[PDB]
Design a protein around this ligand. Sequence first.
Ligand SMILES: [Cl-]
Ligand SMILES: [Cl-]
Ligand SMILES: [Cl-]
Length: 163
Amino acid sequence: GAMAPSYRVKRMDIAKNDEECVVNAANPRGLPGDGVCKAVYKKWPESFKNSATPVGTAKTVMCGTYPVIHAVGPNFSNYTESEGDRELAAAYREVAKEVTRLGVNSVAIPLLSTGVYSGGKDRLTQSLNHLFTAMDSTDADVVIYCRDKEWEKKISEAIQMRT
Ligand SMILES: [Cl-]
Ligand SMILES: [Cl-]
Ligand SMILES: [Cl-]
């Protein structure tokens, strides 16, 4: 575990993270996809061998010795708000299990279901709060990756509010 487990946020490509493992915002079929998933496919293509897994689950595949945790958030275009919320919470719980099992001291994580799976809504708070619910009981350093400047500020504020 980390000496003083922390949350941080960075605005940059998760494919250039400085952590001991990465969470992919995967699709259920293990396809290259777009957004975070396409950057992850370009950086760690070996990790997409038998990475297909259902919505609300996470499946880890090693790229060399570097773990890629494929976490499948719901597409809110297809799910009801209620069922979507349940599956998004579940995906983050399965990430916490994998991070714990791997014995890593740090993990890079995107906000699941906030991009093309958002069903055109702002889900920063919803997705971040499910991330916290899952990860608060782990002792890995968590580094949240985003691309938008206003998102960076809102995620930073939410982290510092608890401190
Ligand atoms: Cl970058
Ligand atoms: Cl997404
Ligand atoms: Cl973002």
